[PDB]
Amino acid sequence: NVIQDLYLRELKDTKLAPSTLQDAEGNVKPWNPPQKPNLPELELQGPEALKAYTEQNVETAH
Amino acid sequence: RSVLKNTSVIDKIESYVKQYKPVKIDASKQLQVIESFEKHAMTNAKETESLVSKELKD
Numbered sequence: 001n002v003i004q005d006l007y008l009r010e011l012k013d014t015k016l017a018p019s020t021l022q023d024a025e026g027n028v029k030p031w032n033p034p035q036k037p038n039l040p041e042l043e044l045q046g047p048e049a050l051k052a053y054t055e056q057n058v059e060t061a062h
Numbered sequence: 063r064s065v066l067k068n069t070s071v072i073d074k075i076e077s078y079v080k081q082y083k084p085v086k087i088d089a090s091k092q093l094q095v096i097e098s099f100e101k102h103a104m105t106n107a108k109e110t111e112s113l114v115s116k117e118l119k120d
Contacts, residue, residue, distance in 0.1 A: 021068060031075045037086045044095045050102045061110070 063072040 021070070024068065031071075031078060033078065033082060034085065037084070039087070040089050040091055042091050042095065044099070046095065047098045047102070049095075050098060054102060054106075 063069055063076075066072055
């Protein structure tokens with residue numbers, strides 16, 4: 001009765017209330033990419049270090 | 063994704079993730095420094111070994 005009246009009135013006269021996807025974007029964190037793939041620097045590259053190390057520590061093992 | 067009903071951004075970040083999927087590429091940088099290091103180390107190691115072995119028998 002009143003159930004029917006409400007059911008009808010409610011459903012018909014506005015089903016959903018307005019919404020916009022564009023507005024949502026502002027209020028949510030946007031995807032942003034990691035910066036740089038990165039490559040590790042060549043650690044202790046070449047015998048520059050070795051020649052230095054042999055001389056630097058010619059320290060024996062006692 | 064089936065959680066989100068606003069889905070038109072999950073396809074976006076999915077495609078962005080799969081795009082940048084080799085996020086960081088391969089590295090073997092220890093192959094020039096490891097071999098050089100191995101030569102100096104080996105030379106010294108064998109020298110020490112031979113020296114102390116020699117002394118033992120002496």
